[PDB]
From a paper:
The envelope with the surface proteins surrounds an icosahedral capsid that is formed by 240 copies of the [name] ([name]). The building block of the capsids are dimers of [name], which consist of an N-terminal alpha-helical assembly domain and a largely unstructured C-terminal domain (CTD). While the ARD is projecting towards the capsid interior, the NTD forms the capsid shell with protruding dimeric spikes that contact the membranous envelope. Instead, most of the mutations with a secretion phenotype map to a hydrophobic pocket in the center of the spikes below the SS-bridge in the rigid part of the assembly domain.
Previous studies have shown that CLPs of both mutants are structurally almost indistinguishable from wt [name] with the exception that Phe-97 adopts both alternate rotamer conformations with similar occupancy in [name]-L60V. The maps of both mutants with added TX100 showed TX100 in the hydrophobic pockets at the same positions as in wt [name] and in [name]-F97L. Phe-97 in both mutants was in “conformation 2”. We found that TX100 binds to the hydrophobic pockets irrespective of the secretion phenotype of the [name] variant.
Author numbering:
A (entry chain B), B (entry chain A), C (entry chain C), D (entry chain D): 1 to 143
The structure:
């Protein structure tokens, strides 16, 4: 159906395509962040925000993927295929999951405008080669 | 996070357990309906509704699962494990995907109130013993 | 019953496990700090603050646990069981005790707002990658 | 440090020594009384009273000591030392726990004035030799 996860929020896969893989914390770290910061709201019966909605749905998807991984580890006889499926799930799907968790948590924290400006500036920085860009990337922080 | 995907909309996993698993249409049929009725609103850059948001996220998760299934069919050589994984994905995960797609499409089309009343009425129907269970099961309609 | 030591102050065990366990100072350091800064108020006959009340109760519980440890050392003869009990007490009970002492001392000193924001920021920091977080760890300061 | 559990409220360990140790009910009975009368206030996120603030901490200390007792029963293999530890806990630390529970539940149910007057009157009654001691001891009541 050609749907973009972030077009509804004012971003675009081509905008977050620049952030590397080493930019996103682990899935456990991002889930702990989401819990400690917005658990009372995600477990709430209210439409608190589209970010909350999408974040709930993504957490449910990841839970079902973990269920799949456990089922595989328990029900597959071939260790090669089992490990291959589990590694695919974790690495590749969690890359997208981390991307989405980061986007939504960071937006809820800072602001849509702030996050999009950070994305533009980080793209400017990461497109520039090292010989002509500063060595320290831009930084989004509450400190 | 103990999150319920229907609590922000007014239902629960216990109110939708009134409906059996063989009740929900196919993922093919539900995606056909979703396209035909809300393609231009799901592809839109707007929080048209929390239902639209959740439905976008669910469709994206299902697309990622289909990608996983194709990747499995390609890479995994063990036919037993390949078929096991594909069948688990489809049957199990698509069961929940059908529940979610049904809930959101039906709500968008008819009303949260109508869908909850339909759930309680279908519970009445399916609990009624067959000797007094009418054959004309409840059904959602606009007419 | 289901009582949380912190939800009357505006925190949570989840929000204090958001920081590492190797972050919290030793029980002796925290007791020295408590003495130095608030001895006259903890020994005072006044509800100076809920923080003072909770800190009094915690210090008394830790004193009773140390009494238990000495009683074990002098009565129990099996060195295995003796050392095992003392180690359990110290490690496990002191983790919680020093989390609580840290929370309450730091609150009395800086502010509930400051301490909660510090928890959030330090967790996000220690979870963020180095190349994209500030390089210096956060720290509370009255200076 | 030298902290008194009761001078913050208007009593002392000496004013409570008028009551014998045989006087205090079981920890089970006092926790039942608490769960009956102030459960929804001890489980609340509010500084309802210093009495609640202290009773929460005491209940948590007791829970941790019960956890220690179970951990000992499991991880120890010298029943002599195991029983020594459990008995010491339940008797020695239980006496203080039930003193504190009595004091707080009473000052919450009746009041500081009533409880202190009761302590003084019971001291009179119990210092009075038996030959001149009425049987109608002072008994806290709202009737
Ligand atoms: C195997 O299923 C048994 C019945 O499960 C019903 C449980 O009720 C909650 C299910 O709700 C959902 C629906 C969809 C989903 C997501 C969005 C994760 C989609 C999926 C199943 C395609 C991964 C998660 C939970
Ligand atoms: C393999 O990594 C590629 C990097 O990402 C490229 C762009 O991907 C777009 C991200 O889109 C999605 C799609 C689905 C999801 C959900 C929420 C369904 C979660 C997932 C990945 C666990 C299935 C998240 C982001
Ligand atoms: C063995 O009993 C001797 C009687 O001693 C009573 C006077 O000592 C002070 C009592 O005050 C208390 C009350 C409670 C406590 C805490 C809160 C630490 C609870 C406990 C006893 C469960 C560890 C500590 C001291
Ligand atoms: C190994 O410990 C794990 C860390 O657990 C952190 C969460 O702890 C939940 C209980 O919290 C507390 C905190 C303090 C306390 C007091 C103050 C009573 C002191 C103690 C730990 C000496 C009993 C009791 C329970």
């Amino acid at each position: 159906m050609d749907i973009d996860t972030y077009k509804e929020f004012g971003a675009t896969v081509e905008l977050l395509s620049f952030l590397p893989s080493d930019f996103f914390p682990s899935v456990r770290d991002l889930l702990d962040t989401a819990s400690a910061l917005y658990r009372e709201a995600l477990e709430s019966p209210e439409h608190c925000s589209p970010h909350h909605t999408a974040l709930r749905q993504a957490i449910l998807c990841w839970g079902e993927l973990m269920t799949l991984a456990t089922w595989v580890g328990v029900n597959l006889e071939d260790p090669a295929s089992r490990d291959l499926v589990v590694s695919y799930v974790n690495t590749n799907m969690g890359l997208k999951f981390r991307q989405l968790l980061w986007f939504h948590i960071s937006c809820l924290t800072f602001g849509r405008e702030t996050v999009i400006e950070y994305l533009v500036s980080f793209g400017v920085w990461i497109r520039t080669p090292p010989a002509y860009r500063p060595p320290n990337a831009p930084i989004l922080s509450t400190l």
